[PDB]
Amino acid sequence: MKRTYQPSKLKRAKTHGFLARMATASGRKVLKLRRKKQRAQLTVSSER
Amino acid sequence: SYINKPGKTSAWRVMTVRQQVSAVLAYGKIETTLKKAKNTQKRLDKLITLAKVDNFNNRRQVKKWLLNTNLFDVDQLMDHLFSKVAPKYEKTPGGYSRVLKLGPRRGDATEMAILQLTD
Amino acid sequence: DVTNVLLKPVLTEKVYFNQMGETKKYVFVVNPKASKTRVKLAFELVYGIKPLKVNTLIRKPTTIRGGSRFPGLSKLEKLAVITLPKGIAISVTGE
Amino acid sequence: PIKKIISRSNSGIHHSTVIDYKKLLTTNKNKPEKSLLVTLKKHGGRNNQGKITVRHQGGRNKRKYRIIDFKRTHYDNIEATVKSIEYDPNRSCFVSLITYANGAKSYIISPDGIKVGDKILASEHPIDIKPGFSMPLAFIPEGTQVHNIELHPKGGGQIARSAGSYARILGQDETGKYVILQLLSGETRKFLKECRATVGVVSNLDHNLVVIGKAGRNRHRGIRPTVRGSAMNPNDHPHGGGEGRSPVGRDAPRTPWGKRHMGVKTRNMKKASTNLIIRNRKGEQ
RNA sequence: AUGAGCAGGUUGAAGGUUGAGUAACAUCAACUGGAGGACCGAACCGACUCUCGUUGAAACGAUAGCGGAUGACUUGUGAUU
RNA sequence: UGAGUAACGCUUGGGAGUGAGAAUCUCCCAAACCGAUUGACUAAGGUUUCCUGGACCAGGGUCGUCCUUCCAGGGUUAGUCUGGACCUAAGCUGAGGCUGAAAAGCGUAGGCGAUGGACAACAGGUUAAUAUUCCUGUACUUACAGUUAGACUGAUGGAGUGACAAAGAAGGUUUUCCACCCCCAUAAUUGGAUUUGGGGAUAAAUCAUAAGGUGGUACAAUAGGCAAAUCCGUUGUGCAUAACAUUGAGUGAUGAUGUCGAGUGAAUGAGUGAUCAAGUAGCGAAGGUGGUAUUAAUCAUGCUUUCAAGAAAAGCUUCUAGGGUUAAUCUAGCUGUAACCAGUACCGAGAACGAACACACGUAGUCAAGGAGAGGAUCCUAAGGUUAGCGAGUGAACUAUAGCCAAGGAACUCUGCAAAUUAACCCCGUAAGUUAGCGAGAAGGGGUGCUUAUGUAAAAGUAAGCCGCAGUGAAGAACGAGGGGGGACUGUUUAACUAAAACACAACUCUAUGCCAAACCGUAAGGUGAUGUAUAUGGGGUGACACCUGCCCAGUGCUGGAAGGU
Ligand SMILES: [Mg+2]
Ligand SMILES: [Mg+2]
Ligand SMILES: [Mg+2]
Ligand SMILES: [Mg+2]
Ligand SMILES: [Mg+2]
Ligand SMILES: [Mg+2]
Ligand SMILES: [Mg+2]
Ligand SMILES: [Mg+2]
Ligand SMILES: [Mg+2]
Ligand SMILES: [Mg+2]
Ligand SMILES: [Mg+2]
Ligand SMILES: [Mg+2]
Ligand SMILES: [Mg+2]
Ligand SMILES: [Mg+2]
Ligand SMILES: [Mg+2]
Ligand SMILES: [Mg+2]
Ligand SMILES: [Mg+2]
Ligand SMILES: [Mg+2]
Ligand SMILES: [Mg+2]
Ligand SMILES: [Mg+2]
Ligand SMILES: [Mg+2]
Ligand SMILES: [Mg+2]
Ligand SMILES: [Mg+2]
Ligand SMILES: [Mg+2]
Ligand SMILES: [Mg+2]
Ligand SMILES: [Mg+2]
Ligand SMILES: [Mg+2]
Ligand SMILES: [Mg+2]
Ligand SMILES: [Mg+2]
Ligand SMILES: [Mg+2]
Ligand SMILES: [Mg+2]
Ligand SMILES: [Mg+2]
Ligand SMILES: [Mg+2]
Ligand SMILES: [Mg+2]
Ligand SMILES: [Mg+2]
Ligand SMILES: [Mg+2]
Ligand SMILES: [Mg+2]
Ligand SMILES: [Mg+2]
Ligand SMILES: [Mg+2]
Ligand SMILES: [Mg+2]
Ligand SMILES: [Mg+2]
Ligand SMILES: [Mg+2]
Ligand SMILES: [Mg+2]
Ligand SMILES: [Mg+2]
Ligand SMILES: [Mg+2]
Ligand SMILES: [Mg+2]
Ligand SMILES: [Mg+2]
Ligand SMILES: [Mg+2]
Ligand SMILES: [Mg+2]
Ligand SMILES: [Mg+2]
Ligand SMILES: [Mg+2]
Ligand SMILES: [Mg+2]
Ligand SMILES: [Mg+2]
Ligand SMILES: [Mg+2]
Ligand SMILES: [Mg+2]
């Protein structure tokens, strides 16, 4: 059956990418908390 | 339970005896399971006794059992059987083949058996 | 010009297959930020014979030594395939 | 006139009817003039926020907007000639490709009764009472049909633009302006003296009698299924809930958003245009 | 918004041409024409029934039948509420 | 503990070899399934899973010397392919600006944004792994400079083209296919063989010729195209069976003394031999005639009909503006120089993707063989591919899947649920009712095989004869009649217990709405309605078609109203 996650290189980068998070005040706040938690994968851009 | 394997159907059984009988006639020895060797012996002996007259009717009868092997085709196996093997058993009152038991297989523990032509 | 875009020559089965039969093909590794024109210019100023054409390869980094206690990634390579004209064969070592 | 459609497809029976489009249109083929052709983007009943605003809209076919000269004031004093009457998918009334003497082309709402080769001319003088001639309301004798009425003088056409729409002149006012106009739906208004209008009735008078025969024809026209309020849940509509077919239940029918809407008047009487209305289809003012 | 798909086979509308007919219409006959939310039936879409499965092969399916299948159709990509 | 219990998730036999150990690894011969697919090319995704050698800690539902696992090394070549350096659709962003306690929302000019438009390369070979990319052969395109000859050059702007729907049927040319012919191998001990089997090819590009398709052609006046116009548009005249302009599948010649080609087939070396080596290198013949009442591809962005009336921009052509005149620019030819960035491996799924699993699920497009067949249905196979990653026995009860069952034939059961009958083609025949369209494949019947002859282009059919219990001998094909309830119908719906009488639908009616319209999203700007105008829009109710829709204005709701009381 058609499961929920259908991978797409564009949709992922354009929805949860660094530039997408850096376009609104809310996105800056989420990124600040993830830097506070020192997440190695800050966003989905750094896939590798 | 469904989508089961086809299984040991009657057609599969006839083909298995046919395949084994062609090989034992070509080479002279077969290493199979005991319960399979005990079933190919009947067909092997029956084929040999009917092939003692060497007429064209008997060739058509034998051809319903022989199959192509590595060492012989279906037409030289005919010559090998009717000119080399069968003439040897010209006055033996049956019992041209022997089945003896080997050890158990390492991975199955089934009882192996060697089927050979008794000289 | 600065000649940091010629890092290291590489010798494999493919390289030696090309490096025989009249026109020779020499495969080097170059700066991943360098362009074909820079590769031709570097070869001009440090060897002296004009390349006939240049081909480029990008080998993506991949995981190496997988399952080892500390896994590591590969290194980004740009490969350049220079082909010198008929009858000329210069040595990569010895100047 | 209208022409019936005999489907003879044995899936229900539908006495569908369509406009002839053969003896009323010059060429049956679709060959619009390229210059005055812009494409329309289907909003789908959604505003700039992307939220559905007017329900039951969406799914129409692709159309190209025909630029219509509602103002008809730029090329005044220049004789124009109708060349062909064609079909416009964005309005019920037919549109005529007219050409002016200087060589300019334009589209106008086609008055009924004109054929290929009938001369047209608009300006702000007496001119002549001929069908399609557009002049200001000061010079129109009382009694003639007029369509494409202009509300703001020097503006563009706004009133009586649909198929078979017209208006009558009912004298003047003592003010020296506000010529009387009897419009459709039995309403009398006072239109400014300088306002410009075109005489004649709009074509396609038989657009009432067209009968759709199928759901698909209406869906392709751009209408989505309208769900009744009685079939809804007790949420999303006042007339919902119930166990089976239930009546209104309230004191009066209500909108989906919860107002009475039945018989109540929803006109803002404190408008600058109230004083220019004589009757409102029911009574005085 | 922009693209793509519906193997194959039937029924033979409106309209048009000709002839008869009419004072002229109407009407009838032959030929042409190929319309239909038309018909049978694969891919495709959907999920009406029995059985099996219910710690499954599977957090909803399998076999055998079943409905639609040129359209209010199916679907890919992109956007949006 | 359950318990060494359930389970181990669709595929066989043998010979030889390696190895300490082999049903499971390698090779060979068969065998069984797929064959509108388990075959081949790719998009998306996956991200080294691809090739070679080695290993058998762990993973593989068993084993393992083996693996998509692990270790080491290696592998992805572009002026022409897919995308940028070109263009825009929905939409996004958006200096100023508008709106808003703040954060922010809306939005103009600009800028992004393919799933679309424009743009120059084809054939063969080569490595274990790449190939329109490397090599060979033959080409093409765009820039820059010099040069020769000709010409006045003409855009950031105007105009034309680009530029387009659905369905259907005719043609033209190549094909598929048929017949003949050419070439290659074969001549058969099982009864008779006088034959059997296979192949018959060549591209882009250049030149010439093109069946046709599309649309009238020149001349003259012009006030219109943010200025200008010789271009466009408009108005006249002449000629208009044609001319002129543009486009065009195919054909012939080079490309090709090339390549491919059925088949024939080594040497060298490894090895104990066979065998590998390899069926590899190399060699490599013919490489054609006619028809078609059969086929698919193209011309074709062609034509006809219908209403639901069917993208934008870039680019190309043209027009002047604007620049030249002792020049620049453009065109054609020659010579030379240059052509950037990213992807290119492999899988593409009963084992590499989305489902936690080497999970019976799901995933766009493209190529589509033979026989019979309308068919891409159905059965068997071709090219090709796999051995369903636990086996061997036995044939108890019992279960699942199938097959069959004498006499009766729904007596079973809540109910003919399920199962069973019919089934393809051809020839007869076909009622009540009706909105005259239907009902209807109504109901009910008959024939089908093989041979000879007659029929045809091929048939179909016709006549005679023969065989069997049975002749679309197997596979795939509708069970029917009658009465009633509801819904007019086709459709839609509770992903994963309810597909229905429910929803919707064409139709009827009421009500509001004169345009800065009513209604609606927001707080507002702004926007939908609508680039619409009462033959229009929104809401309530009813739900084809036909006939009807009665009484009550006391209460409630709605509309209007003089004054008077609060
Ligand atoms: Mg069988
Ligand atoms: Mg590259
Ligand atoms: Mg345009
Ligand atoms: Mg509505
Ligand atoms: Mg309900
Ligand atoms: Mg409520
Ligand atoms: Mg209620
Ligand atoms: Mg009730
Ligand atoms: Mg249908
Ligand atoms: Mg426990
Ligand atoms: Mg235990
Ligand atoms: Mg127990
Ligand atoms: Mg037990
Ligand atoms: Mg068990
Ligand atoms: Mg298994
Ligand atoms: Mg097995
Ligand atoms: Mg098969
Ligand atoms: Mg496949
Ligand atoms: Mg890995
Ligand atoms: Mg490997
Ligand atoms: Mg290995
Ligand atoms: Mg193990
Ligand atoms: Mg090249
Ligand atoms: Mg762009
Ligand atoms: Mg694209
Ligand atoms: Mg490969
Ligand atoms: Mg013989
Ligand atoms: Mg001007
Ligand atoms: Mg590849
Ligand atoms: Mg699958
Ligand atoms: Mg997976
Ligand atoms: Mg498996
Ligand atoms: Mg697919
Ligand atoms: Mg086939
Ligand atoms: Mg099939
Ligand atoms: Mg039977
Ligand atoms: Mg029997
Ligand atoms: Mg019985
Ligand atoms: Mg009976
Ligand atoms: Mg009983
Ligand atoms: Mg009973
Ligand atoms: Mg049943
Ligand atoms: Mg009936
Ligand atoms: Mg009754
Ligand atoms: Mg129904
Ligand atoms: Mg239905
Ligand atoms: Mg459900
Ligand atoms: Mg259900
Ligand atoms: Mg407002
Ligand atoms: Mg608007
Ligand atoms: Mg409406
Ligand atoms: Mg109702
Ligand atoms: Mg009712
Ligand atoms: Mg009263
Ligand atoms: Mg009141």
Author numbering:
A (entry chain 0): 1 to 48
B (entry chain m): 2 to 120
C (entry chain s): 2 to 96
D (entry chain a): 2 to 286
Provide passages from the article that reported this PDB entry.
We find that Cm leads to the accumulation of a number of translation elongation states, indicating ongoing futile accommodation cycles, and to extensive ribosome collisions.
Surprisingly, in approximately one third of all 70S ribosomes, we identified a second copy of the small ribosomal protein S4 bound to the LSU (hereafter called S4LSU). The S4LSU binding site is located on helices 12, 13 and 18 of 23S rRNA, a site that has not been previously reported as a factor association site in bacterial ribosomes and is far away (about 200 Å) from S4’s canonical binding site near the mRNA entry channel. The flexible N-terminal domain (NTD) of S4LSU (residues 1–30) protrudes into a cavity located below 23S rRNA helix 18 and contacts protein L28. The outer perimeter of the cavity is formed by 23S rRNA helix 15, which is similar to that in Bacillus subtilis in length and conformation but is missing in E. coli. Ribosomes with the S4LSU showed no obvious difference in their distribution across translational states or polysome association compared to the overall 70S population. S4LSU, thus, appears to naturally occur in M. pneumoniae ribosomes, while its function remains elusive (Discussion). In light of the diverse roles of S4 in regulating RNA folding, we hypothesize that S4LSU can serve as a chaperone in 50S folding and assembly.
